[model samples]
Target: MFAIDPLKHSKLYEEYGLYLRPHAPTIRSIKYASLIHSMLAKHAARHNGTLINPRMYADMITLGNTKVTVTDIVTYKALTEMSTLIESFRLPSGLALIIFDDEKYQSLIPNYINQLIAYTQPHIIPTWQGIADFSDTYLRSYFKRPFELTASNLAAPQKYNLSPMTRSIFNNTGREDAVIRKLYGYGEYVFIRYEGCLITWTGIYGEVTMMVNLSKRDLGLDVGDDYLKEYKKLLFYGVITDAIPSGISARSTIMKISPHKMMNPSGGALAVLSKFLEAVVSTNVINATLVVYAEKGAGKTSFLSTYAEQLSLASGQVVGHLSSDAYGRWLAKNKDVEEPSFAYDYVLSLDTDDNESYYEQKASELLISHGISEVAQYELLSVRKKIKMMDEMNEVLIAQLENADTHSERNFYYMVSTGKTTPRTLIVEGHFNAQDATIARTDTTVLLRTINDTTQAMRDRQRGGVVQLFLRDTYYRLLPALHTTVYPFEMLESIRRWKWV
Candidate 1:
């Protein structure tokens, strides 16, 4: 599912840049949703536009859906407008629909004397557009008054959405060439439903007080129906629609970070955070996505909440934190005492049941289409040719993922831009975020690399022994850390845990 013409769609040749919003706004509340997507889109713009965060072709996170390096700028313009429009929450005065994750509207919606329903009420709506219309009308009439903004710094409110993380790495070199690019080709911004996601702090939903969709609504004869029509219009618009950074009012774009800045694996995440603060002031990318590409175990989960906490303390900017790490997820669910609220302010984490399979099926299909079939066990077949076929299969997968990332990174940047604040750079921590084709290289990259490989020790001990072969075989999956530019970094051996786990 690539482009009709690679060269024409290629952002490498475009101006002012083109990008898409990808399932724009999903019309869902953001209690820390997927910024891994935000993770992807940012770089796509930087690369295709300024060529700021240049990645080795292997490090492709978001290649565009097309064969080109970015999405059509026109598409991004339209979708971003739709997103901006909804952000206003304006419906004429009358029956209104409030979609909230909470029930009594004790949270962000209108906290007026009455009219506290309709915030994320999509599931409660009956069925079909027609059936749903009846409910929408009744609900609209129930909260007849127009929406008004609520003023309350009472809880010091924070909002985030939980977006899951997913990836599938096949045989040696398989991870880079295959799966990731296809993810973008399929027009998906995330490996969602798999759990363990980057929690992006969108903004405090109840940041304003409104009872109905009232920005600038004049009472119409059947104004609620106007909303119904508008609702219908947006769904259609979403299909057809999807910016660059130029925000609502202020227009001060930060200079892109270097693709080849100072590199250091000496310090741990703490050092990375320090260097991060230094760059924040130096580069002045206060409101942006900062990738803490920590190794598997080096307390990647632990670092994020604290990273932002420290950032908030150092700089006056309120931090919006996002992570796909498990500790944050556990703390969210456990809630024994505290609301791991400190850990990740915006997102909640959970592991996926079988996102692995979901990723592989697509990769396999792409491989077969290229006249390449993966062997169940090329070793068992004892056929040199099957192994050769396996190699060929992975190469095709890599190309697909590579070109796919061209757009993936492009759109990823746009998504990240929406939630992140300029005062405090939003933090996105994950192992694979910047590994091969880093989608976040546009903003900044903090690599966490290990000095020695336990897997490598197993490799030298040649193994007819299953244990030896297992370690040797798995070593390829780790693939060693490779990055062209990392402003803040870390280096520790045992911390790098996921060697083909």
Candidate 2:
């Protein structure tokens, strides 16, 4: 029988925060938590739908003499959140052995393969209605609240989107940005002088700016991509060293801010982020689906492009950037042009490729599961290789997608369907992904935001999520409960427009 201790009113904090607390967890609670964690992880490791190792690191942790394995425990949410838990765990940092921990505080240890475990995995993690249903059959009696968002955990300014390491110990060195830029393949590091540099305030919100000399001879170092096509004009990244505040600073306004260059995310910042995507895809697996969405103008494309490059560099696979906008235009035009709605033609099952069955797309892996010798499988694949070059796919096909409804539908299907064309990983970026989500659920979803930026900082920046946060009606609401991973990129992103003189 599935057994657990009955939670009391003290353990359940309803009304005010609506979160569950262990209060004083007993041996029974620990046992249940451990068992659930083990089962979930074991099954997950076995289910290699994409063939990436879920347990790339050790799933268990050794606390004192006890070992608890199962990633995603570092999350500061409650033990009860396992029921409705969204499974988005990062790779762990080496196997960890904790010699010390408190009721709520701790110091941690590790193994080499368990890289992200120390930072992300805790041998416990947040939920699933599936796992929950498997356990709690008497939902009404056990659950006081339904499956909406209760006070699960909290998000705050200091640590809202921070990595576990940074959340534990803070760092202000801009070296984090330097490493992140290196990983992302852009952004440069240099010194700047601020003579007219001043930090001004209006109530509590304040900003500081450093002015540069802009002399080519003085700034001799090459910043790699020196020129940026901003405003259809060229702008250069100048060091502007020996900078001080501009304009007459009459008192009661401007104050000089110090330690200019180091005011960025602490060290190991990008190292923390790469722990998630890199490990999941590093296995020479041509299987990844990433969707990035935000309010708007939050540089989703830029972030996506960075990801695309990194995936290709790190995975050694041909990554595909599915044109989300192209797909959107095709869908809209087809509906407008009375596009004879080309429905998903079905065949039969994952058994044979008769062309009459659904998902029966001659995928040898699916077909070979039923019949045929391992030798003929090789021949079938060789034939497929020969026919690949015969397909007439190019700009013409992509352009015609939005012209006629039938072509649009077919093209859309082919682009996503494995029956005809392909790519290992696909990264699509946009806001209106509801339609896209309907057709195919992505493997990972990244929510981007230009956090804590002032208008003064963002010169002529397009409207992002900021304005929409205050909109009327249903258009403006807080983020949906489900999120894969959240990262505050703006702090590391440059505010200045990149155009060279």
Candidate 3:
């Protein structure tokens, strides 16, 4: 594995400096940086690029968190053109398909969607959004034309498809889970039945959303069948297709955030939201069939922020950010806590870079292909790094000595750190996880080895973790303390002996 020097590659800053020289770092730069990173990251990731492979399949799909912006639809058109060049290099992988379960309109084409439908048809329970049947004057004004759905002319909304009592039961707090289970098998058809998943977000639905085939219509296409054809075969399978920052104007690009920056729920309030995200995430985990790994640089952070904003608006709560130490304390305090009685829902973001445990599991296998040896190919059994910070002398020691004697073995970690309103810094740190622990009698010397063959003498303390996050904006509006006191749910409850601030 080849490693790039962070200082050398700091050209991202230089290039960005030149580009932003005319404009400078405004809200536009912040937003543009996010959009550029996330869209490209998700796009590159979905196409199977990892830290191992960071090159773009399409030249049109520009990358780098610092330099560019996907200015318009024409920009995407150029991207499509570049995709052709990428395609000329690959051999066909064979038949693929995808499907989404939502009604009103199918997300993708017949082939892919049909394939998914067939896979999970036995477990499907037709559902509805209930927006069309809304009758309140305020709501009606917001509905699309021809909204009424009478039994005589049009089908009744799915929310009312079951009986009113069933609807009531479905809405009932005590029975929501059971009702959700019966209604959609908790997406068992897609999860367990069809083998779906929830890699990106909370359980079931999160998993399904990741795996489900999205529609070109949903993605804003009015013309040719290019997306349609891709849909037919689930062509762009296992990737983030449309990461539109919720807006219609060009300024929407400013809303981008990286996947690594998404803040997880923290503090006493996290107790409630964690469960909600878990339940939802469980749905994603069980039902998702294909796991397409895509991440926005900080889009996930903003995406969750928007979700919190919606909750605040709907429930009339205020939300914003929380401190890391506070969140850590909250988790530690709740280590033995019990579950809440009244179930509520919230969104949470999991660290995609927290795959250290995962890497540990596959380390041996990884080393097999990536090791350098003569006698035997020793898999990387384990790698442990200790960073000591007690006295003024802060030292970090990493150990990785595979059985293979040849120095071809390679291991890498990327670290990102962000603070305040500053831009992020990424450093690729590569080093042997182990060293010669030869305990000498008089001289206490530690011999460190480099992971990369090129940088044998190089010592890397710059990279601490594979994933880096700057200060992120997490709108924790759902938490009672952080939110406003006007929330209806808190007010409607007769069981509570307390009043929420």
Candidate 4:
């Protein structure tokens, strides 16, 4: 059920060369191929626990040529991913439909309320998830009063949609850095110089340079309290203005690479990952169990940060970051100072593996001493995967949902009841009774209390079997799965670091 693509096959060697030649303009042509080959070989083909897209854009340019347009489709990876962690709700019985929109209010409370109402209602409460303007006077009337709110890295005061009728999209011709600079408690957006007729959107990844320009002029921009501090580590990939063929070609390398590196996965793997991290961090330690490990070129640091992000979204807590040298000094100074090894409820370790042998040994020993067994790896290096659920999660679940009924497959989904915590385990095994062959069905039996499954003796209507009291709440049908877990949100995260911008 689970698959891994190294992504870095012989072909990317060629791509690395081509992309590098344009980006790293200083490198000589004769040695460029050799240098690229060496770097490509040393890098892991993907990020964290998923395959990396070979077609991803690499550097930043200005959005000078055309009016900027963003397809939610382009953000499909981030949107669909968080959507899956969200539970699907049902009535006392029968099938239901869920729908998403940009006009609905989003918060933990809304998620919970929708689920509770759905589960208790006789008819399924068709659901929809989307981002909308809170300021819209008419749209604001639909939602009930006393609204609940939470801190979010993804939050933006102003809302935009691709459609024309919506006013979220605006003119930015005279507004340089209008895209990147925040004004009126809103996020930043500005125009940049065109890269030979190519206009670019400078996401958080390139905010620093944009800020430098903003400060020089009065731009009348108001930076957030910690804008530079938060988005420093965001990485960026430039857009592809040229052609990249599917089959092998002189310019083809990513295609030539292994198949494992290109395919996408679904919610199961990310669920397992988030759970594993929570379980690990909740251990006996002086601080949270901080473990970071990843293979060469796998972008381990980037992967771990995404894990941290999901945690932030779940708990709404500001995670602290300490430098390696600072952490060492902090430990040494307190090692023998009569401190009783203060332990936190959770331990956080980002998967930033630089030395395979040394870091692996130290991390393992530390984990054991702390009395924890369930260790989670963002990606498999030279190790075998022990958990089956995580292994085939995205493959089976995302694939099955994509192939489900066509009309039911939109961005809308109704959640039955929301819970306090994110689900622990995800199962997308086949619903045998649905078809002669094992047709996959997603579930979340792991989240509810054991009594909810064992005591009630629930029966699954979909497959005609006992609702394996085990499966709690899982995938609610939605749009087809697009990008895997290695999304830009996962790769390009903001961090508390050198914050000049």
* Winning candidate number (TM-score): 2
In model 2, the runs with Cα more than 4 Å from the true position are: 1-257, 260-286, 337-419, 430-439, 451-478, 488-501
Please give the TM-score that candidate 1 achieves against the real structure. Answer: 0.27
Clashes per candidate, residues 3 or more apart or on different chains: 66, 48, 48, 56
Candidate 3 per-residue C-alpha lDDT over 1-501 given as tens digits, one digit per residue, 9 for 90 to 100: 001111223342222111111212232323332433344445445433532222322112222111123436543543443344333323222111111133322421222123223323122222222011223231122111122222242222353343321111111111233444565333321110111111122111121112322332233322222222323222222222123221111111211111111111122233333333333224343211100011112122322333445434443434332211211222223324453111111101212233222222232233233442221222122222101111111111112223322111111110011222211111111111122221101111111111011111111112221111100001111112222111111111211322223
Instruction: Report lDDT (CA) for all predictions.
Output: 0.30, 0.31, 0.23, 0.24
Candidate number with greatest lDDT: 2
- Candidate 1, residue 455: lDDT: 32
RMSD of model 1, in Å?
A: 30.6
Regions of model 3 farther than 4 Å from truth: 1-214, 221-299, 323-501
lDDT of 4: 0.24
Clashes of 2: 48
TM-score of each: 0.27, 0.32, 0.17, 0.21
Candidate 3, overall lDDT? 0.23
**Candidate 2 C-alpha lDDT tens digits along 1-501:** 011212322221121112222222223333443444444444445434221222322233222122333545643122213223312121122223212112111111212213324334343311221012212323322222222111233223233433222112111222343453354332321212221111222222233232222222233322221112121111121111222222211112323322211122222333333433553455564455656555433344545565566556655676656443434344433435543333322111111211121111222223344353243343355544423411212222235334423445335544354433456566555443333433344445655543222222222233322222211101112234244334443212211111112
The candidate, 3 or 4, that scores higher on TM-score is 4
Rank candidates, lDDT, best first: 2, 1, 4, 3
Candidate 1: worst-modelled 10 consecutive residues by lDDT: 192-201
Model 3 lowest lDDT segment of ten: 469-478
